[PDB]
Amino acid sequence: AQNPNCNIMIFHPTKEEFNDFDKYIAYMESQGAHRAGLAKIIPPKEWKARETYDNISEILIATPLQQVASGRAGVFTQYHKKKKAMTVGEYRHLANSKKYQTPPHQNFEDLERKYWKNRIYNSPIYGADISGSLFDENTKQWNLGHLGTIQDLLEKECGVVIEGVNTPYLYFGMWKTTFAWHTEDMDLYSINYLHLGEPKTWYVVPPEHGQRLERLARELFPGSSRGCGAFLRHKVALISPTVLKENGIPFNRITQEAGEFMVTFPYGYHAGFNHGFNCAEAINFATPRWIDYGKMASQCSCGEARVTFSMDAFVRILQPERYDLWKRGQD
Ligand SMILES: O=C(O)CNC(=O)C(=O)O
Ligand SMILES: [Mg+2]
Ligand code: NI
Ligand SMILES: [Zn+2]
């Protein structure tokens, strides 16, 4: 078995190998990359997402989210308070202000220490889940706005035509902005490209060990657990690496820098934080190997997780018994 210790793998495709997206994902899996839950892909040196970022300041962040924490430094939840709209240029100025900017630090490890020590005492503002793309339309390779769609994959594998569309989302981050422990909707893959700015640190649990994370989460968030049988779908809970280590949960960590892709694999729990002002783009995708994960994916039916139009069809076709109760949650 390849990559039996479930380490995060880093790949360096040539421009020739960067032509066929599906093929390269299958290659990475042939080397065991999926076992980690997360992989890094460094694009060929000749490749670019677009010519410059000089003209992005007038993108609107219609609903910036202030991420307010409750709990203890290593075990907390966050809620998102909606703020007034601002442009990317306004947000970047805010991120660089004395109140919100990255503190002085020695290296990524020192900054990681400061994050876990101090995150709960601040409420950074996140521009998340903004439909759109920063890839130039002429970028032919690994353009996240030109991927094959999950509906087309399901149709190719299973023969059923379904409604729904699949488009990318932009994320504008600042120091301490946080992504809670989650897997993707319907335990899909994701791909994330860091277009610009400061790094993003990731934590991930191997798919084969995901239930160990879930059992810890039920112990650490006991009222949330009683409220919903899949409360990590709410995307609100954080657990530090120190706490994971104290409880024997297998995980790995890596820092993504501007110009790099990350791929998350089906049922790979992940969480993380941004180091400073940055912009990422991400989208879900599927392969044939995903279908079995989609069939088995947990669902939130308490009503909190409330997700896309396109997830309907996935539940209806892959999980017809759940369909009924899940849609009661979504209506
Ligand atoms: O970058 C972020 O804030 C969150 N991204 C992801 O969870 C992803 O790409 O799967
Ligand atoms: Mg603009
Ligand atoms: Ni994700
Ligand atoms: Zn729920």
Answer for the pair 9, 39: CB distance below 8 angstroms, yes or no.
yes
Confirm or reject: Cβ of 282 under 6 Å from ligand 1: yes
Atom number in ligand 1 closest to CA 270 = 7
Residue 95's domain comprises 1-331
Q: What is the DSSP string of 233-271?
A: GG--EEE-HHHHHHTT---EEEEE-TT-EEEEPTT--EE
Cβ of residue 264 lying under 6 Å from some atom of ligand 1: yes
Task: Judge whether 75 and 220 are in contact, CB under 8 Å.
Answer: yes
Q: How far apart are CA 80 and CA 177, in angstroms?
A: 11
CA distance 225 to 219: 8
Give the list of residues 6+ apart from residue 121 with CB closer than 8 angstroms, or none. Answer: none
Please give the resolution of this entry in Å, rounded to 1 decimal. Answer: 1.5
Ligand nearest to the CA of 194: 1
End-to-end alpha carbon distance in the chain: 44
| 108 CA distance to ligand 4 middle (Å) | 34
Write the burial class of residue 156 (CB in 10 Å: 0-12 exposed, 13-18 middle, 19+ buried): exposed
Beta-bridged to residue 126, according to DSSP, are: 65
State the CATH number of the domain containing residue 221.
Answer: 2.60.120.650
Bridge partners of 69? 78
Closest ligand to C-alpha of residue 179 is 1
Query: CB–CB of 99/125 below 8 Å?
Result: no
Written as six digits, the tokens of 42 are: 């460094």
Q: How many helices (H) and strands (E) would you count in the chain?
A: 10, 16
- Report CA torsion sign: 218, 221, 227, 231: negative
198, 193, 187, 250: which is closest to 40 by C-alpha?
Answer: 193
Helix, strand, or coil (residue 124): coil
| Total count of domains within the chain | 1
Q: Ligand 4 center to residue 245 CA distance, Å?
A: 27
How far from the centroid of its chain's Cα atoms is residue 192's Cα? 7
Complete DSSP assignment for 132-174: ---S-TT--SS-TTSSPPHHHHHHHHH----------EEEEE-
- DSSP assignment of 51-94, as one string? S-STT-TT-EESS-EEEEEEEETTEEEEEEEE---EEHHHHHHH
Question: Which residues participate in the annotated binding site?
Answer: 126, 182, 184, 192, 200, 228, 234-235, 270, 300, 302
Q: What does the block give as tokens for 196?
A: 């610009």
- By 3-state DSSP, what share of the chain in percent is helix, strand and coil, each rounded to 5? 30, 25, 45
* Residues with Cβ within 8 Å of residue 205, at least 6 apart in sequence: 37, 212, 213, 249, 250, 251, 268, 269, 270
Pocket test for ligand 1, best of 67, 192, 263 (most atoms within 8 A of CB): 192
Closest CA to 101 of 279, 276, 280: 276
Q: What is the distance between the alpha carbons of residues 39 and 67, in angstroms, rounded to a whole number?
A: 27
Ligand 1 pocket, mutate which of 193, 201, 235, 270 (most atoms under 8 A from CB): 270
Query: Which residues contribute to the annotated binding site for Zn(2+)?
Result: 228, 234, 300, 302
Residue 204 Cβ < 6 Å to ligand 1: no
**Is any atom of ligand 1 closer than 6 Å to the C-beta of 179?**
yes
The closest of 120, 123, 116, 152 to 286, measured between CA atoms, is 152
Containing 312, the helix (H) or strand (E) segment is helix 311-318
